[PDB]
Amino acid sequence: CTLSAEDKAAVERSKMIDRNLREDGEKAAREVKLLLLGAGESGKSTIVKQMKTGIVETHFTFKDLHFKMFDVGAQRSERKKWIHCFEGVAAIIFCVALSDYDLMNRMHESMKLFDSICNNKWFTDTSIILFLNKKDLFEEKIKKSPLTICYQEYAGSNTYEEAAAYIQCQFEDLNKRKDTKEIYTHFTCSTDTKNVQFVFDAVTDVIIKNNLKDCGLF
Amino acid sequence: SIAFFYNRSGKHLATEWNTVSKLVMGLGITVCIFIMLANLLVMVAIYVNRRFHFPIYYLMANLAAADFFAGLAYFYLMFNTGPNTRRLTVSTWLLRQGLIDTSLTASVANLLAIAIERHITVFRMQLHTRMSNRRVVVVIVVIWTMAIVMGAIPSVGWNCICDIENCSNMAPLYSDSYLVFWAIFNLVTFVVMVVLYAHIFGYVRQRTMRMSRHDTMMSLLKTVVIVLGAFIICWTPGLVLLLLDVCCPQCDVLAYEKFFLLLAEFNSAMNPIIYSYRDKEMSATFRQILC
Amino acid sequence: ASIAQARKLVEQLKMEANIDRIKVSKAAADLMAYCEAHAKEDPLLTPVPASENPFRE
Amino acid sequence: VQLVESGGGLVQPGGSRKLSCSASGFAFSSFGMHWVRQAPEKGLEWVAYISSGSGTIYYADTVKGRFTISRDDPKNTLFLQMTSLRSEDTAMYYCVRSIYYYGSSPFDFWGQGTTLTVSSSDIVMTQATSSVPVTPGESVSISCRSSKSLLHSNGNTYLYWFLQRPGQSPQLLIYRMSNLASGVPDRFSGSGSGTAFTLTISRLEAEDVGVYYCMQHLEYPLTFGAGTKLEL
Amino acid sequence: ELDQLRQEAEQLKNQIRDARKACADATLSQITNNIDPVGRIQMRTRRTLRGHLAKIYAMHWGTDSRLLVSASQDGKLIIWDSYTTNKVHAIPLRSSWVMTCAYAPSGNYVACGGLDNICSIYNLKTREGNVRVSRELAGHTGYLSCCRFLDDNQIVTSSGDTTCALWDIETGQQTTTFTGHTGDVMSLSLAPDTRLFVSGACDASAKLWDVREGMCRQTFTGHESDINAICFFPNGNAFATGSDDATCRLFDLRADQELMTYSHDNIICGITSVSFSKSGRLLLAGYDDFNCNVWDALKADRAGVLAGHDNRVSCLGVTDDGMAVATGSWDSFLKIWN
Ligand SMILES: CCCCCCCC/C=C\CCCCCCCC(=O)OC[C@@H](O)COP(=O)(O)O
């Protein structure tokens, strides 16, 4: 052996730490990591207030699946130097305010952010949960102000169902990888509860489509 | 002597190059080449590529190793049958049939172990799980444990030499009880295959249909059917013979077994295909080898 | 920040330009002299014998 | 940081007595606990050693088998169960903590221990100096003798130097050849090489007096030196 | 007015460059001629530290050159006994988003910092057997990219708030704050005499600072993309950088400019970490192509690769005695190369 009475116990300490790190890493592997993004003042805090300075990490439990969401929009730094930390996140919970299509345009800035994160090299194979929220303000803004006052490229009328679905199709159209990742788009308002269900339902599709890809099944 | 058991069970000694004997060897040498070459290619491509070093893909390599043994056993069996079957003793004949019994139990158990592994790495609820390599090496040395033990139980143990009154007419030196148990084992495996491949489909269908209306069915039902239809068209004709010779006196003929053994081992030929064709990385890996 | 930012970078630049400089021939030779003086005491440079190497076994 | 050892007292011969330590003030779950006995007239003698997490457990060859040790990590409590208490178990059993990593200082904090009374291969550690007289402010270098070399292949010499001040629990001074403990003055300086070992003091005050114990840790069982009682 | 100030900054930068190119008597690559090259030397791995379960972003050697510390995203700050591959400590960080770690020169303290904008200082040698936070150094308005212990009570942190700041462990407040660095600062390297320090940022500019005076003494430019890592020469009068522009540049303090561009046409990945071997004859650069390139720091050639990593190498550093170099990577593995 050629191990001293203290090198034997120093090895035992190392062996016992590994048991604690394996237990810590097995617990940390069951926590679903979600990268919350989106433009500021775009209803981002709305989709966090239903359950539970740099990263504002939020942990919420839903249907025996421990989630962990990273509100990272407070960094205000060059995102190219810390967005690689979020490899292996189950999904990117993108939050886009529908009402911010005319307030130099927030929608153009929000659409540019979706381009920068859907086509990112680190997120080339992870899904995006796009949250087109604040439809309640979007409904009153469409009726009061037509979309042609800010967007002349639209062909449909200033209704609600076709206008909201237009932004849905205009936001899942910037994915340069239409098959590697899928944008799971949801419509939510302040008086809504199914948004947390949509996140749990989307990542189950993300987990399975990764699980099927694991054992060569799909 | 070898004609002691063949004549008692009713088999015929093809002392010359019978027209059936050249025929069963005619499609046999081509199949033996295809079993050996394709499965060795799967073993080589998995080993030389560092991306494939994953617990599930080892069971695809170990299945190719088991099928490579199935081609080697059949190649040795073909050179041991026909005009060459009369120059055999009791001990070395059990080394022939025992080599093809452990060549297919190793293939079928490897086939079930992938279906067991697929039911494991689908129901997990983590995006990335730590690659515990000890859960497949344990299974691999258990696959061969089941292969070696069951493939040598006729060699030492369960035989109809001691109890002549129950000898299978298809395999004259194999007890009818063993053929019942061995056919039950593949019935057990395929039933578990269907159960594990319908719980996979039932779990994926139920869970991914929630997000359909906020294409992975026809790409998964086709996969499930192929890996379940291969074992039902290339192993059930073999398994129906193992039950046709039991509880049926003077039942069918012995001309089925030479053709059915070809398709019962043609599953070992399509196993490197039906398990290594969806992977576009592995299909291109094969293309890079041939250029 | 119209005046404070512009003047701060100007004052930073004017005090940085007053730093005394030495020609590279003196500075590059001093960098080579450090390696030549400490060449023997660099285990990664020249592979030392495994007797005193502590990462062997 | 304290170790309040409980139990003990007058025990009839052939009986059993459960010795307990109420460890508190530290991360006890990562500490390899010990037990060190001491006869009222003789020197120290190591009893047992239970590692962290109830791992590897050693015992002295004198009392192996009939002594069974245990620890309670959630309760931060350390037990020592002993049966058939002979006439040689009338010793004061001290409780010691010790952690083992690179640069660690084992045997650093000793509990006050409990007093036991009853009705009535190994490396040898001997120190021929005893009842040494010396004036305060001078320099004293007591010595300890080992059977073989304590220097290891790695280079660590597992000699330990303690200080049982009169009426108080032992306190670690030098936990290696020369590695000074934390919480002791810089005046202490262990030295020696191979088999010969010594501990040197630059100047001694009226406080650092008592009986100094030398102990090996090269391998189990652990053997202490005799009584080296410094006198003022 | 405003026009003069922009003109003054433009003419001062031209005045700096005019004096800079005048002092370029001879490049170091041309000067280091007719010398014996290091040659292709293989430094095989000796010990593989296999405890981390997530992407390692930083490592640091103790001054004893045997103890090692490392930080990853599993929320662990593992302390390694590199000689025997033993875990001396494992510290559960409250914020698993760390991009740096440091070992005190004394060895009693270990720091870590990251996306939580807080430098956590951990006390190793406590009377209790655990490792606990001494003082969390909050006060940065960006991600903490690098940190280096000056003494047991002083540590200067390179942050994502485009500023560096020297701290004080006793009080927890920045004694001085180093400003004037456009773009967020990604790494820093203390001097051997612990008097000055340089810092690389996303302006592709490395700035030398006076620690006590708090003033940016010098600015080094020449990189095309952002600098991810920096490392002082062991002499302390020079340093080499690591940038996403896929070249390492050696800047001399006295010469105030570049010396060489450790660039290869076959390499396009950006350097994640840079470390100078003792005597500075070998430069250990941790590249992003799943490999570390050992650069002969006195020539423009490479002294060899070591490879051995299944992901991007994110941290590497030689020992204080030069015995070995440990190269952490995103594959959660630390390998001691010797
Ligand atoms: C015939 C196919 C049956 C289906 C079962 C799979 C293949 C056999 C492997 C394991 C099952 C237990 C042993 C059954 C032996 C069946 C007979 C056989 O495989 O060869 C006998 C015969 O043809 C060869 O011709 P001869 O050499 O002239 O006797």
Side-chain angles (χ1 to χ4, degrees), chain A residues 1-22 25 27-40 42-48 50-51 53-56 58-62 65-75 77 79 81-99 101-103 105-108 110-111 113-124 126-135 137-142 145-151 154-157 160 162-172 174-175 177-181 183-204 206-218, chain B residues 1-49 51-130 132-249 251 253-279 282-290, chain C residues 1-41 43-57, chain D residues 1-4 6-40 42-60 62-74 76-87 89-119 122-128 130 132-137 139-148 150-204 206-218 220-230 232, chain E residues 2 5-9 11-17 19-32 35-43 45-116 118-127 129-212 214-265 267-287 289-309 311-328 330-338:
Chain A
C1 198
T2 82
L3 269 199
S4 154
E6 315 206 330
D7 293 298
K8 273 198 237 150
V11 158
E12 161 156 40
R13 164 179 194 80
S14 150
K15 264 157 43 195
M16 202 184 299
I17 287 182
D18 299 324
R19 200 259 291 267
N20 303 346
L21 304 190
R22 260 194 295 279
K27 165 68 219 98
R30 319 166 330 96
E31 267 155 319
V32 165
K33 302 200 284 135
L34 300 153
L35 176 55
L36 173 59
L37 283 155
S42 73
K44 197 202 294 320
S45 68
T46 279
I47 73 168
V48 197
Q50 68 271 350
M51 240 173 223
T53 311
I55 278 176
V56 186
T58 310
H59 333 278
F60 58 100
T61 326
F62 199 84
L65 182 43
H66 302 106
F67 291 100
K68 172 181 267 204
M69 181 175 38
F70 315 114
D71 193 348
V72 86
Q75 262 296 320
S77 272
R79 78 174 31 255
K81 300 307 299 171
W82 50 261
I83 213 66
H84 53 68
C85 301
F86 304 108
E87 291 216 350
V89 291
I92 294 182
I93 306 185
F94 214 106
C95 206
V96 170
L98 287 156
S99 73
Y101 62 85
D102 43 330
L103 319 88
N105 193 6
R106 294 196 185 181
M107 219 53 154
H108 280 129
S110 201
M111 187 154 331
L113 198 55
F114 205 89
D115 224 31
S116 56
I117 215 76
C118 215
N119 307 19
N120 214 345
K121 48 163 146 297
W122 313 117
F123 305 112
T124 193
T126 182
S127 87
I128 298 198
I129 301 176
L130 168 72
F131 262 118
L132 305 172
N133 47 5
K134 274 198 275 155
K135 331 174 312 290
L137 257 284
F138 180 65
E139 164 75 28
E140 320 184 325
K141 208 173 293 297
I142 274 287
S145 162
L147 210 77
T148 183
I149 212 173
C150 46
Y151 249 79
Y154 191 35
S157 73
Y160 165 68
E162 81 186 350
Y166 179 60
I167 302 180
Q168 162 156 340
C169 90
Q170 213 64 70
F171 260 102
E172 311 156 292
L174 318 90
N175 39 2
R177 271 123 290 174
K178 288 259 198 319
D179 41 1
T180 326
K181 88 195 71 84
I183 300 75
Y184 302 88
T185 280
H186 200 206
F187 276 98
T188 43
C189 77
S190 291
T191 65
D192 217 7
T193 313
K194 309 270 141 269
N195 36 18
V196 60
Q197 172 68 318
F198 186 86
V199 182
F200 169 75
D201 257 14
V203 302
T204 293
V206 179
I207 280 156
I208 287 170
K209 287 176 182 97
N210 198 11
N211 280 357
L212 297 176
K213 272 180 52 200
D214 268 358
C215 53
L217 252 186
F218 156 75
Chain B
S1 87
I2 201 47
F4 181 33
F5 298 102
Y6 280 19
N7 292 323
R8 174 167 270 154
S9 274
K11 260 161 107 161
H12 157 73
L13 271 283
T15 172
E16 282 107 11
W17 277 116
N18 197 13
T19 326
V20 195
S21 298
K22 336 202 186 213
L23 182 64
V24 296
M25 227 176 73
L27 308 87
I29 50 183
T30 36
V31 159
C32 272
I33 285 287
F34 199 41
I35 298 184
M36 291 215 88
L37 290 204
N39 284 279
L40 162 53
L41 257 283
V42 160
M43 280 216 78
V44 161
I46 284 185
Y47 197 83
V48 304
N49 178 270
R51 174 171 31 51
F52 284 131
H53 284 37
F54 270 147
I56 166 70
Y57 292 73
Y58 296 152
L59 289 163
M60 270 149 216
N62 187 40
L63 160 74
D67 294 322
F68 171 108
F69 195 34
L72 205 42
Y74 199 25
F75 209 59
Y76 169 64
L77 177 131
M78 281 196 318
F79 281 179
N80 206 270
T81 188
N84 210 266
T85 181
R86 45 174 145 84
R87 38 186 102 194
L88 271 275
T89 80
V90 162
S91 290
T92 169
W93 191 91
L94 267 284
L95 183 156
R96 169 191 103 173
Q97 203 71 233
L99 221 70
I100 207 143
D101 209 339
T102 189
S103 90
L104 298 189
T105 301
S107 170
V108 168
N110 259 296
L111 279 184
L112 168 63
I114 308 183
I116 274 178
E117 174 96 23
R118 284 172 174 183
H119 194 260
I120 289 313
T121 89
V122 154
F123 281 67
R124 61 172 56 151
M125 279 302 219
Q126 306 133 33
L127 193 94
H128 26 77
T129 306
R130 189 164 145 269
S132 99
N133 221 74
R134 90 162 300 277
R135 212 204 40 239
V136 300
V137 175
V138 153
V139 165
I140 279 182
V141 308
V142 157
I143 289 161
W144 293 105
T145 290
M146 192 55 148
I148 289 298
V149 158
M150 154 175 298
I153 270 176
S155 181
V156 278
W158 266 8
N159 269 293
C160 95
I161 319 182
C162 295
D163 313 330
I164 276 300
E165 48 180 359
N166 41 329
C167 283
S168 92
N169 41 7
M170 192 145 77
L173 290 96
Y174 275 54
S175 77
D176 64 338
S177 70
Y178 175 74
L179 287 203
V180 164
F181 176 72
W182 203 92
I184 277 285
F185 157 74
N186 280 353
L187 187 129
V188 154
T189 283
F190 181 72
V191 155
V192 170
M193 281 215 178
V194 162
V195 162
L196 290 198
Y197 276 129
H199 200 190
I200 280 167
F201 194 77
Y203 173 75
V204 173
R205 186 186 48 82
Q206 160 163 9
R207 263 55 164 204
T208 65
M209 81 185 168
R210 318 194 263 198
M211 301 285 328
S212 89
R213 223 159 311 275
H214 58 255
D215 201 272
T216 187
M217 278 325 78
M218 288 326 113
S219 148
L220 187 51
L221 177 95
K222 168 182 183 303
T223 304
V224 163
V225 155
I226 284 182
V227 310
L228 283 181
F231 214 86
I232 212 162
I233 73 165
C234 292
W235 259 103
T236 318
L239 248 61
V240 81
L241 269 198
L242 259 61
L243 261 281
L244 267 195
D245 78 275
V246 171
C247 302
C248 199
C251 205
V253 291
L254 313 146
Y256 289 147
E257 74 201 56
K258 305 281 282 288
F259 286 83
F260 278 7
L261 174 90
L262 182 55
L263 65 96
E265 274 196 331
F266 195 43
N267 176 224
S268 300
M270 69 188 35
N271 273 343
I273 289 149
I274 72 159
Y275 274 79
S276 275
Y277 80 115
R278 283 167 329 268
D279 306 60
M282 201 185 298
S283 174
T285 310
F286 298 148
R287 195 191 66 84
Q288 285 190 14
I289 295 178
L290 64 103
Chain C
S2 298
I3 276 304
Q5 174 79 269
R7 261 167 181 244
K8 193 180 288 192
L9 302 181
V10 156
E11 279 211 284
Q12 180 70 250
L13 268 164
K14 68 158 71 76
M15 106 181 178
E16 268 180 49
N18 307 328
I19 283 296
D20 183 32
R21 261 159 203 88
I22 271 180
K23 322 285 280 184
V24 194
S25 176
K26 179 168 175 185
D30 287 343
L31 212 53
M32 206 201 323
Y34 190 87
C35 328
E36 293 265 15
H38 301 70
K40 314 302 311 293
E41 310 101 48
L44 302 185
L45 187 46
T46 61
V48 294
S51 158
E52 76 273 338
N53 207 265
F55 292 102
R56 278 303 105 86
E57 272 303 308
Chain D
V1 200
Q2 72 184 301
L3 276 87
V4 179
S6 265
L10 201 76
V11 191
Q12 63 272 322
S16 76
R17 175 41 70 71
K18 172 166 215 70
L19 268 198
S20 66
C21 162
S22 194
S24 68
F26 46 83
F28 158 83
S29 307
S30 70
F31 275 138
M33 280 305 219
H34 283 269
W35 277 95
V36 172
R37 85 208 262 160
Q38 195 204 30
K42 266 78 61 184
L44 295 166
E45 172 156 20
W46 166 77
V47 164
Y49 155 70
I50 169 167
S51 184
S52 37
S54 308
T56 86
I57 296 182
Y58 298 99
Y59 294 101
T62 320
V63 298
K64 195 179 273 188
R66 60 175 275 259
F67 275 47
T68 181
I69 217 182
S70 65
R71 81 190 287 154
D72 202 348
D73 276 332
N76 275 353
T77 315
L78 174 79
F79 296 122
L80 173 90
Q81 191 81 23
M82 25 178 192
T83 47
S84 150
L85 280 186
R86 336 158 168 167
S87 34
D89 288 343
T90 176
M92 184 150 210
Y93 293 86
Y94 294 130
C95 180
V96 198
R97 69 168 218 184
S98 77
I99 195 159
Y100 304 99
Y101 47 83
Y102 176 64
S104 149
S105 89
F107 284 72
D108 53 324
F109 198 82
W110 292 49
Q112 300 284 342
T114 41
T115 287
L116 213 46
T117 39
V118 289
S119 296
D122 304 12
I123 300 102
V124 188
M125 272 318 188
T126 171
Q127 331 163 260
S130 290
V132 171
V134 67
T135 178
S139 93
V140 49
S141 297
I142 79 164
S143 87
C144 164
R145 174 71 31 191
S146 38
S147 90
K148 69 217 213 180
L150 293 192
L151 204 172
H152 219 283
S153 196
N154 47 53
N156 289 325
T157 322
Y158 311 96
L159 171 83
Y160 284 69
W161 275 113
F162 310 117
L163 176 59
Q164 184 138 21
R165 314 219 169 92
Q168 101 169 42
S169 155
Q171 149 198 353
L172 173 85
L173 313 178
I174 292 264
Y175 55 88
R176 221 63 90 204
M177 192 161 14
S178 56
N179 275 125
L180 191 74
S182 271
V184 312
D186 206 63
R187 42 173 184 257
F188 293 98
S189 197
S191 39
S193 279
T195 75
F197 289 120
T198 199
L199 151 65
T200 81
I201 312 174
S202 291
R203 65 227 167 273
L204 51 153
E207 279 84 13
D208 51 345
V209 79
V211 48
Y212 294 65
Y213 290 98
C214 75
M215 151 185 178
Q216 70 101 6
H217 214 291
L218 193 74
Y220 293 85
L222 312 146
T223 44
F224 292 82
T228 315
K229 206 152 91 174
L230 258 74
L232 76 158
Chain E
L2 263 284
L5 282 169
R6 284 181 299 277
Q7 189 58 261
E8 190 154 28
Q11 73 94 20
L12 272 169
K13 275 182 79 207
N14 284 265
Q15 207 252 317
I16 274 181
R17 274 171 41 268
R20 216 166 244 185
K21 69 185 206 290
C23 94
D25 204 7
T27 73
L28 175 50
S29 201
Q30 141 190 310
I31 277 187
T32 322
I35 210 179
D36 309 333
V38 159
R40 195 218 44 83
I41 41 150
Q42 44 179 30
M43 326 177 28
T45 175
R46 293 308 156 206
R47 275 98 166 86
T48 301
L49 322 172
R50 263 182 290 250
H52 276 292
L53 311 163
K55 294 154 61 130
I56 303 180
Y57 280 113
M59 57 83 50
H60 213 225
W61 285 99
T63 51
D64 51 357
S65 324
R66 152 164 197 182
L67 272 192
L68 204 156
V69 76
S70 84
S72 80
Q73 311 268 244
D74 58 340
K76 283 309 164 329
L77 197 41
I78 300 176
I79 299 192
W80 302 100
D81 187 2
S82 51
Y83 282 14
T84 89
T85 313
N86 260 6
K87 299 219 175 39
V88 176
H89 292 115
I91 319 164
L93 325 164
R94 52 184 50 81
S95 165
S96 71
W97 300 112
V98 312
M99 309 188 5
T100 193
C101 82
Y103 221 137
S106 82
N108 314 67
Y109 289 109
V110 156
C112 84
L115 300 186
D116 63 331
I118 289 183
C119 198
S120 284
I121 308 281
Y122 297 85
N123 196 10
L124 311 185
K125 294 171 181 3
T126 74
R127 283 306 275 147
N130 50 17
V131 183
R132 66 167 168 278
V133 278
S134 285
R135 276 225 62 146
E136 336 198 3
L137 300 167
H140 275 322
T141 53
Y143 68 96
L144 201 43
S145 62
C146 203
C147 74
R148 285 279 164 278
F149 260 106
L150 262 176
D151 310 313
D152 276 326
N153 207 57
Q154 269 159 334
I155 164 165
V156 47
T157 45
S158 158
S159 34
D161 48 38
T162 74
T163 83
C164 319
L166 153 74
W167 298 78
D168 177 86
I169 301 307
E170 197 214 68
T171 40
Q173 294 299 336
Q174 339 196 326
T175 58
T176 174
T177 299
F178 306 93
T179 36
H181 218 156
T182 64
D184 41 57
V185 199
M186 280 285 325
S187 99
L188 87 173
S189 149
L190 282 175
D193 63 329
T194 48
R195 215 64 199 172
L196 263 42
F197 81 102
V198 316
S199 59
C202 282
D203 191 356
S205 81
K207 267 144 88 61
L208 171 89
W209 318 80
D210 198 284
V211 159
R212 324 271 171 240
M215 306 279 211
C216 164
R217 298 228 76 83
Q218 311 177 15
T219 325
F220 302 90
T221 46
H223 270 293
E224 314 264 51
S225 305
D226 71 277
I227 289 174
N228 324 291
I230 199 135
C231 154
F232 258 131
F233 201 85
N235 161 211
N237 278 276
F239 62 92
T241 68
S243 81
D244 278 351
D245 157 51
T247 166
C248 287
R249 287 156 197 267
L250 177 65
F251 293 104
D252 200 323
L253 256 56
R254 306 208 289 277
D256 201 61
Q257 68 214 20
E258 306 221 6
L259 300 175
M260 287 90 116
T261 87
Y262 303 138
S263 76
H264 209 270
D265 322 67
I267 313 177
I268 50 136
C269 67
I271 306 104
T272 69
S273 325
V274 159
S275 195
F276 260 116
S277 155
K278 255 196 53 83
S279 75
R281 193 41 207 242
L282 253 49
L283 162 53
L284 268 291
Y287 273 78
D289 58 352
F290 296 27
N291 207 323
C292 319
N293 290 289
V294 190
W295 298 91
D296 182 19
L298 259 284
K299 310 280 272 303
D301 42 56
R302 196 183 323 148
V305 277
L306 49 86
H309 269 305
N311 209 326
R312 158 197 285 198
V313 167
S314 76
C315 45
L316 84 173
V318 311
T319 53
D320 293 51
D321 69 345
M323 211 45 88
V325 48
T327 66
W330 283 0
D331 53 1
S332 77
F333 285 163
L334 253 168
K335 310 211 156 186
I336 320 291
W337 310 84
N338 198 346

